[PDB]
Coordinates of all heavy atoms in Angstrom, one line a residue:
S729 N 109.1 113.5 90.7 CA 110.2 112.7 91.2 C 109.8 111.7 92.3 O 110.5 110.7 92.6 CB 111.4 113.6 91.7 OG 111.9 114.3 90.6
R730 N 108.7 112.0 93.0 CA 108.2 111.2 94.1 C 107.6 109.9 93.5 O 107.8 108.8 94.1 CB 107.2 111.9 95.0 CG 107.6 113.2 95.5 CD 108.9 113.1 96.3 NE 109.3 114.4 96.9 CZ 110.5 114.6 97.4 NH1 111.4 113.6 97.6 NH2 110.8 115.8 97.9
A731 N 107.0 109.9 92.4 CA 106.4 108.8 91.7 C 107.5 107.9 91.1 O 108.2 108.4 90.2 CB 105.4 109.2 90.7
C732 N 107.7 106.7 91.6 CA 108.7 105.9 91.0 C 108.3 105.4 89.6 O 107.2 105.2 89.3 CB 109.0 104.7 92.0 SG 109.3 105.1 93.7
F733 N 109.4 105.1 88.8 CA 109.1 104.6 87.5 C 108.6 103.2 87.5 O 107.7 102.8 86.7 CB 110.4 104.7 86.6 CG 110.1 104.3 85.2 CD1 109.5 105.2 84.3 CD2 110.6 103.1 84.7 CE1 109.3 104.9 83.0 CE2 110.4 102.8 83.3 CZ 109.8 103.7 82.5
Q734 N 109.0 102.3 88.4 CA 108.6 101.0 88.6 C 108.9 100.5 90.0 O 109.8 100.9 90.6 CB 109.3 100.1 87.5 CG 110.8 100.0 87.7 CD 111.4 98.9 86.8 OE1 111.3 98.8 85.6 NE2 112.0 97.9 87.5
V735 N 108.1 99.6 90.5 CA 108.2 99.0 91.8 C 109.0 97.7 91.7 O 108.5 96.7 91.1 CB 106.9 98.8 92.5 CG1 107.0 98.0 93.8 CG2 106.2 100.1 92.7
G736 N 110.2 97.7 92.2 CA 111.1 96.6 92.1 C 111.8 96.5 90.8 O 111.8 97.4 89.9
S737 N 112.5 95.3 90.6 CA 113.2 95.1 89.4 C 112.7 93.8 88.7 O 111.9 93.0 89.3 CB 114.7 94.9 89.7 OG 115.0 94.0 90.7
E738 N 113.2 93.5 87.5 CA 112.8 92.3 86.8 C 113.3 91.1 87.4 O 112.8 90.0 87.2 CB 113.2 92.4 85.3 CG 112.8 93.8 84.6 CD 111.3 93.8 84.2 OE1 111.0 93.0 83.3 OE2 110.5 94.6 84.8
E739 N 114.5 91.2 88.1 CA 115.0 90.0 88.7 C 114.1 89.4 89.8 O 114.0 88.2 89.9 CB 116.4 90.3 89.3 CG 117.1 89.1 90.0 CD 117.6 88.1 89.0 OE1 117.9 88.5 87.9 OE2 117.5 86.9 89.3
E740 N 113.4 90.2 90.5 CA 112.5 89.7 91.5 C 111.3 89.0 90.9 O 110.9 88.0 91.4 CB 112.0 90.9 92.4 CG 113.1 91.8 92.9 CD 112.6 92.9 93.8 OE1 111.4 92.9 94.1 OE2 113.4 93.8 94.2
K741 N 110.8 89.6 89.8 CA 109.7 89.0 89.1 C 110.1 87.6 88.5 O 109.3 86.7 88.5 CB 109.1 89.9 88.0 CG 107.8 89.5 87.5 CD 107.5 90.2 86.1 CE 107.7 91.7 86.2 NZ 107.4 92.3 84.9
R742 N 111.3 87.6 87.9 CA 111.8 86.3 87.4 C 112.0 85.3 88.5 O 111.6 84.1 88.3 CB 113.1 86.6 86.7 CG 113.9 85.3 86.4 CD 115.1 85.6 85.5 NE 116.1 84.5 85.6 CZ 116.1 83.4 84.8 NH1 115.2 83.3 83.8 NH2 117.1 82.5 84.9
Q743 N 112.5 85.7 89.6 CA 112.6 84.7 90.8 C 111.3 84.2 91.2 O 111.1 83.0 91.5 CB 113.4 85.4 91.9 CG 114.9 85.5 91.7 CD 115.6 86.3 92.8 OE1 116.0 87.4 92.6 NE2 115.7 85.6 94.0
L744 N 110.3 85.1 91.3 CA 108.9 84.7 91.7 C 108.3 83.8 90.7 O 107.7 82.8 91.1 CB 108.0 86.0 91.9 CG 108.4 87.0 93.0 CD1 107.2 87.8 93.4 CD2 109.0 86.3 94.2
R745 N 108.5 84.1 89.4 CA 107.9 83.2 88.4 C 108.6 81.8 88.4 O 107.9 80.8 88.3 CB 108.1 83.8 87.0 CG 106.9 84.8 86.7 CD 107.2 85.6 85.4 NE 108.5 86.3 85.5 CZ 109.0 87.1 84.5 NH1 108.4 87.1 83.4 NH2 110.1 87.7 84.7
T746 N 109.9 81.8 88.6 CA 110.6 80.5 88.7 C 110.2 79.7 89.9 O 110.0 78.5 89.8 CB 112.1 80.7 88.7 OG1 112.5 81.7 89.6 CG2 112.6 81.1 87.3
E747 N 110.1 80.4 91.0 CA 109.6 79.7 92.3 C 108.2 79.1 92.1 O 107.9 78.0 92.5 CB 109.7 80.6 93.5 CG 111.1 80.8 94.0 CD 111.2 81.9 95.1 OE1 110.9 83.1 94.7 OE2 111.6 81.6 96.2
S748 N 107.3 79.9 91.5 CA 105.9 79.5 91.2 C 105.9 78.2 90.3 O 105.2 77.3 90.6 CB 105.1 80.6 90.7 OG 105.1 81.7 91.5
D749 N 106.7 78.3 89.2 CA 106.8 77.1 88.3 C 107.3 75.9 89.0 O 106.8 74.8 88.8 CB 107.6 77.5 87.1 CG 106.9 78.4 86.2 OD1 105.9 79.0 86.6 OD2 107.3 78.6 85.0
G750 N 108.4 76.1 89.8 CA 108.9 74.9 90.5 C 107.9 74.4 91.6 O 107.8 73.1 91.7
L751 N 107.2 75.2 92.3 CA 106.2 74.8 93.2 C 105.1 74.0 92.5 O 104.6 73.0 93.0 CB 105.7 75.9 94.0 CG 106.5 76.4 95.2 CD1 106.0 77.7 95.7 CD2 106.6 75.4 96.3
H752 N 104.7 74.5 91.3 CA 103.6 73.9 90.6 C 104.1 72.5 90.1 O 103.3 71.5 90.2 CB 103.2 74.7 89.3 CG 102.0 75.6 89.6 ND1 100.8 75.0 89.9 CD2 101.8 76.9 89.6 CE1 99.9 76.0 90.0 NE2 100.5 77.2 89.8
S753 N 105.3 72.4 89.6 CA 105.8 71.1 89.2 C 105.9 70.1 90.3 O 105.6 68.9 90.2 CB 107.1 71.2 88.5 OG 107.0 71.8 87.2
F754 N 106.4 70.6 91.5 CA 106.6 69.8 92.7 C 105.2 69.3 93.2 O 105.0 68.1 93.5 CB 107.3 70.5 93.7 CG 107.5 69.7 95.0 CD1 108.3 68.7 95.1 CD2 106.7 70.1 96.1 CE1 108.5 68.0 96.3 CE2 106.8 69.3 97.3 CZ 107.7 68.3 97.4
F755 N 104.2 70.2 93.2 CA 102.9 69.8 93.6 C 102.2 68.8 92.7 O 101.5 67.9 93.1 CB 102.0 71.0 93.8 CG 102.4 71.9 95.0 CD1 102.0 73.2 95.1 CD2 103.2 71.4 96.0 CE1 102.4 74.0 96.2 CE2 103.6 72.2 97.1 CZ 103.2 73.5 97.1
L756 N 102.4 69.0 91.4 CA 101.9 68.0 90.4 C 102.5 66.6 90.6 O 101.8 65.6 90.6 CB 102.1 68.6 89.0 CG 101.4 67.8 87.9 CD1 99.9 67.7 88.1 CD2 101.7 68.4 86.5
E757 N 103.9 66.6 90.7 CA 104.5 65.3 90.9 C 104.1 64.7 92.2 O 104.0 63.4 92.3 CB 106.0 65.4 90.7 CG 106.7 66.0 91.9 CD 107.4 65.0 92.8 OE1 107.5 63.8 92.3 OE2 107.9 65.4 93.9
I758 N 103.9 65.5 93.2 CA 103.5 64.9 94.5 C 102.1 64.4 94.5 O 101.8 63.3 95.1 CB 103.7 66.0 95.6 CG1 105.1 66.1 96.1 CG2 102.8 65.7 96.8 CD1 105.6 65.0 96.9
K759 N 101.2 65.1 93.7 CA 99.9 64.6 93.6 C 99.9 63.3 92.8 O 99.1 62.3 93.1 CB 99.0 65.6 92.8 CG 97.5 65.2 92.7 CD 96.6 66.4 92.6 CE 97.1 67.4 91.5 NZ 96.2 68.6 91.4
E760 N 100.7 63.2 91.7 CA 100.8 61.9 91.0 C 101.3 60.8 91.9 O 100.8 59.6 91.8 CB 101.7 62.1 89.8 CG 101.0 63.0 88.7 CD 101.6 62.8 87.3 OE1 102.9 62.7 87.2 OE2 100.9 62.6 86.4
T761 N 102.4 61.1 92.7 CA 102.9 60.1 93.6 C 101.9 59.6 94.6 O 101.8 58.4 94.9 CB 104.2 60.6 94.3 OG1 105.1 61.1 93.3 CG2 104.9 59.6 95.1
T762 N 101.1 60.6 95.1 CA 100.1 60.2 96.1 C 99.0 59.4 95.5 O 98.4 58.5 96.1 CB 99.5 61.4 96.8 OG1 99.2 62.4 95.8 CG2 100.6 62.0 97.8

């Protein structure tokens, strides 16, 4: 019972992935603009 089945939830992973994709798109468009 001490060992957890999983660390965190899928919502946190989805939020992290969406933030990473948004940051990648923003950095790409900023590089093109520069």
Side-chain angles (χ1 to χ4, degrees):
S729 296
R730 307 303 180 190
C732 309
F733 187 74
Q734 61 167 65
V735 171
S737 50
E738 311 279 292
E739 181 68 33
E740 313 181 6
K741 195 199 306 181
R742 162 172 164 91
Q743 283 175 252
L744 296 202
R745 277 172 299 180
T746 47
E747 281 171 300
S748 305
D749 287 13
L751 280 168
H752 262 299
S753 286
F754 178 73
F755 290 162
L756 188 55
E757 76 101 12
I758 281 288
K759 184 154 54 182
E760 292 202 313
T761 306
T762 49

